């Protein structure tokens, strides 16, 4: 997307799946962008501040979207003892 004199030349940079790192195409109508609101003290959702995950239509159709979300939430601290790396 880069030409000789800098000046990035591209229509847009597509998003990548947060679980499989595959490109989410413009016509991928089975894909999602899960949005988890950050929580401050004593349990307030503080709207506008979010942790975001992009899941592809492929993984959702395969049925590992929930496990992928468990892993991502575990790694990011959203969940505590849900996903086990060693099955």
């Amino acid at each position: 997307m880069e030409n000789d004199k800098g000046q990035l030349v591209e229509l847009y940079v597509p998003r990548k799946c947060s679980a499989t790192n595959r490109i989410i195409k413009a016509d991928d109508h089975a894909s999602v962008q899960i949005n988890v609101a950050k929580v401050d003290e004593e349990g307030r959702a503080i709207p506008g501040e979010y942790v975001t995950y992009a899941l592809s239509g492929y993984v959702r159709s395969r049925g590992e979207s929930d496990d992928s979300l468990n892993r991502l939430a575990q790694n990011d601290g959203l969940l505590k003892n849900v996903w086990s790396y060693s099955r």
């Binding site: 880069e2 000789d4 597509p14 998003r15 947060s18 195409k25 413009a26 975001t52």
Partner: protein, 217 residues
Amino acid sequence: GWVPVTKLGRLVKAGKITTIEEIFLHSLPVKEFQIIDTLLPGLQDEVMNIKPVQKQTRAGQRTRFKAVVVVGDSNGHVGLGIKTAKEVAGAIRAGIIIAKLSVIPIRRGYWGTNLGQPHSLATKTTGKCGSVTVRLIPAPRGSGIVASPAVKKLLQLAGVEDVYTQSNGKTRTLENTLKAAFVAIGNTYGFLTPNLWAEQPLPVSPLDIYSDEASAQ
């Protein structure tokens, strides 16, 4: 005028969404052609073929006409629409609507050195529809479009000016050939390349940012 029915149409009419690249980035389903009209006004149209299809009945054969319409500006957007109708004009008009709905972004790359604007495809791509397989291969500057006239016209309406094409199957099935080339040219942003390896901050959707004034009652 145009009274939007969906949240995307409401945002686009209100002016919160200004370019179709936001649509493509968030992969928002598009249901009203007025969105495409107001985001890409310079979207020109072409009719590829008109063919009759017939259904046998008690009282002879009833004939309808199926129109293939390619829309697109020469700056990286095309859409393909196939519509059958009782009248040729009606089929063409509805085909124009359908192609505008089905507009898709394509990825222009370089064959060799990146001197100037992109002139070819970033990667060889292949699409299939029925028996027809269409393969587009990057070509050096000054090569032109090496394709049959229909696929060539679709590629010019896509903005590609240097590409080789290799076809297989019953290419005389024009609708299958054009659908196969549409799939191939749409897979360009589906193919992952090292320059797209960098992680992105995953932006939030306009349907969530400009959401308080959408779906107003």
